[PDB]
Amino acid sequence: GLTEEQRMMIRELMDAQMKTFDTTFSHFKNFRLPGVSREEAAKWSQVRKDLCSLKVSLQLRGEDGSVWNYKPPADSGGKEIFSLLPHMADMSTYMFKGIISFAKVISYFRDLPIEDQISLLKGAAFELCQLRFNTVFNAETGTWECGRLSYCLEDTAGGFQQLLLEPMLKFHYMLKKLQLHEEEYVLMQAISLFSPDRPGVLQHRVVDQLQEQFAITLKSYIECNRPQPAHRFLFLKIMAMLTELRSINAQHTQRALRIQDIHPFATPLMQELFGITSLTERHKILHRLLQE
Amino acid sequence: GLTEEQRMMIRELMDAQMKTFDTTFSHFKNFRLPGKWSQVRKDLCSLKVSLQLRGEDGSVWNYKPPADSGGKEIFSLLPHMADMSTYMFKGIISFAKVISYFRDLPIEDQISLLKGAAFELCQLRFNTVFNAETGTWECGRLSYCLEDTAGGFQQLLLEPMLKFHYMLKKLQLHEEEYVLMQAISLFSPDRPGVLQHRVVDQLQEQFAITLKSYIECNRPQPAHRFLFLKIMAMLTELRSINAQHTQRALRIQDIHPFATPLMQELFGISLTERHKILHRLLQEGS
Numbered sequence: 001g002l003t004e005e006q007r008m009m010i011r012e013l014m015d016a017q018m019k020t021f022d023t024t025f026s027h028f029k030n031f032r033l034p035g036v037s038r039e040e041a042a043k044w045s046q047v048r049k050d051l052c053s054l055k056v057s058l059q060l061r062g063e064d065g066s067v068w069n070y071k072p073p074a075d076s077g078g079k080e081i082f083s084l085l086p087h088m089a090d091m092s093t094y095m096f097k098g099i100i101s102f103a104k105v106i107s108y109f110r111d112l113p114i115e116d117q118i119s120l121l122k123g124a125a126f127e128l129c130q131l132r133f134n135t136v137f138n139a140e141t142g143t144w145e146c147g148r149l150s151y152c153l154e155d156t157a158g159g160f161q162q163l164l165l166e167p168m169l170k171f172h173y174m175l176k177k178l179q180l181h182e183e184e185y186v187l188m189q190a191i192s193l194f195s196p197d198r199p200g201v202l203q204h205r206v207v208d209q210l211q212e213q214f215a216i217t218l219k220s221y222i223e224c225n226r227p228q229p230a231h232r233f234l235f236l237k238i239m240a241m242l243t244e245l246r247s248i249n250a251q252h253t254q255r256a257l258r259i260q261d262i263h264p265f266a267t268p269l270m271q272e273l274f275g276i277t278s279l280t281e282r283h284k285i286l287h288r289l290l291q292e
Numbered sequence: 293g294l295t296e297e298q299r300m301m302i303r304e305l306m307d308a309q310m311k312t313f314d315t316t317f318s319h320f321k322n323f324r325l326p327g328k329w330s331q332v333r334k335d336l337c338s339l340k341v342s343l344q345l346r347g348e349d350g351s352v353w354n355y356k357p358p359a360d361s362g363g364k365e366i367f368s369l370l371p372h373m374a375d376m377s378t379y380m381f382k383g384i385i386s387f388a389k390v391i392s393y394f395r396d397l398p399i400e401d402q403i404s405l406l407k408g409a410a411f412e413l414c415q416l417r418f419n420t421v422f423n424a425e426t427g428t429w430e431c432g433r434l435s436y437c438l439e440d441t442a443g444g445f446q447q448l449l450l451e452p453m454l455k456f457h458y459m460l461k462k463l464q465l466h467e468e469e470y471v472l473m474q475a476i477s478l479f480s481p482d483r484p485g486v487l488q489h490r491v492v493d494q495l496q497e498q499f500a501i502t503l504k505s506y507i508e509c510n511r512p513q514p515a516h517r518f519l520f521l522k523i524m525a526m527l528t529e530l531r532s533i534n535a536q537h538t539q540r541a542l543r544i545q546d547i548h549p550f551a552t553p554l555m556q557e558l559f560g561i562s563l564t565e566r567h568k569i570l571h572r573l574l575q576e577g578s
């Protein structure tokens with residue numbers, strides 16, 4: 001029911017996704033692991049709240065059948081709250097490098113000015129990373145199952161209703177319940193990627209047109225591949241969750257910048273995305289990875 | 293009710309224990325961690341344990357051992373257990389060194405006595421941190437919890453060492469009775485290579501007599517009836533287990549090397565030349 005041009009758009013996105021998403025995290029190697037003034041105090045107080053929302057226990061399953069489990073320390077008002085940030089910095093960097101590869105395979109993204117390619121990836125990196133994380137999220141166990149690595153949310157003593165208070169965790173449970181297809185996920189990634197109102201975009205109109213065509217393909221896909229009455233508003237549900245994911249990005253990018261101030265964790269590539277220190281000059285790593 | 297000489301002996305032994313037993317394992321660092329075949333496989337499964345590492349920050353690293361698939365996975369934790377045993381032994385060496393009765397012995401007998409009692413004295417110290425209700429050796433920041441096995445206690449108690457640890461804990465001995473057991477085990481005159489048998493045998497007898505006198509002057513209850521003869525029976529049992537597990541350790545060593553340099557000196561059957569590390573540690577000072 002889709003046009004051939006729409007069918008090819010989905011084929012190119014699914015192809016890019018297959019080539020750049022390591023669903024088993026098999027190539028995520030060599031990562032760090034946790035080891036065995038008044039205004040400045042205000043900055044620390046805000047960071048303590050930020051780190052507490054998304055606390056997870058880490059699990060590593062070995063080839064031999066062993067299981068190494070790490071349980072996060074409870075907040076004792078010290079640098080113990082930053083125990084997993086170095087590992088999460090290596091994971092986010094591994095994910096963003098694959099998100100950069102995803103965009104490069106897409107022909108419509110390659111034909112853009114590289115300044116616009118950097119700005120689109122700078123504004124969408126968190127969003128396409130959470131979208132990929134959602135596909136490995138088990139809502140029954142609250143665990144991101146990333147190959148041998150597993151990340152299980154801790155109970156926080158409140159309940160699933162205390163977890164849903166956190167917009168990020170609510171995004172993951174709600175998106176997982178829509179039970180989207182692989183094609184609908186990759187279309188969400190494209191719609192997020194080709195956001196015309198990202199900071200620094202100059203081809204605003206050209207990018208907006210691309211986004212509209214991706215959304216129409218997703219809208220038409222939902223019409224032609226799902227029972228029409230029951231999934232009548234599924235497209236609008238996806239788009240509203242994409243708008244919420246844009247909001248969550250702004251919150252957590254600023255949470256990450258607060259934590260970076262008091263306690264640096266960012267990798268050189270994540271630093272460029274965060275703006276920590278011309279668009280090409282400020283993003284030399286991202287520029288080189290795109291230029292390849 | 294004890295003589296002054298007996299009281300001082302208990303006092304020297306308790307002072308040595310406090311100075312040489314790192315009950316928190318706080319100075320146990322830089323240890324390896326996890327990253328004929330039929331005889332070994334059943335042995336290691338009986339003593340299967342999960343490892344827990346609690347951090348200063350409050351974090352907990354837990355290692356669950358792999359199930360026995362018949363491969364080498366059975367010896368996953370042995371490299372770490374060898375570094376643990378060796379740390380305990382070096383504190384045992386320090387314990388002996390401080391004892392006046394032991395330091396005045398010939399260096400050739402200090403090596404021979406410690407060679408024969410090293411396992412026994414470690415297991416005695418391990419029993420003091422053993423929680424029988426949880427089957428977990430609580431070694432400060434490190435914990436070693438016995439993994440579940442079909443049959444439970446019944447099936448695990450078939451392992452002589454686990455049976456020794458559950459039985460010894462049941463006697464709920466005092467620190468004084470533990471440290472005197474260490475001395476009786478240490479000053480074993482019939483250990484291989486001792487040449488001053490009579491001097492060591494005389495020392496052993498006075499330790500045993502002091503232990504008998506301590507129990508009579510401090511433990512009037514019916515549960516502690518025959519407690520001295522029970523303890524002496526257990527020290528005889530631990531000597532048997534020492535031979536079993538020292539021979540089991542040599543079999544596992546042949547197929548899969550795990551022993552530290554100091555343990556290889558222990559297992560190697562001039563005495564000073566054949567035990568160069570143990571010789572150095574004895575000459576070194578507390």
Ligand SMILES: CCC[C@H](CC)Oc1ccc(C(=O)OC)cc1NC(=O)c1nnn(-c2cc(OC)ccc2OC)c1C
Binds near residue numbers: 168
């Ligand atoms: C592997 C499990 C995924 C889980 C799902 C939410 O996530 C966590 C769980 C727990 C923690 C945590 O408590 O450990 C301190 C942290 C994160 N999550 C990030 O650490 C993180 N996830 N995405 N990003 C990020 C990536 C960007 O480009 C790709 C750009 C900006 C970003 O953040 C603002 C980060 C730093």
Ligand SMILES: CCC[C@H](CC)Oc1ccc(C(=O)OC)cc1NC(=O)c1nnn(-c2cc(OC)ccc2OC)c1C
Binds near residue numbers: 376411418
């Ligand atoms: C922390 C609680 C210790 C627990 C109490 C029985 O024990 C184990 C539990 C589990 C295992 C295991 O399944 O790991 C794969 C191994 C051991 N136990 C030794 O590893 C061990 N205990 N003592 N010694 C030893 C020491 C010597 O002096 C340095 C000389 C010879 C020795 O052995 C013949 C060893 C190697």
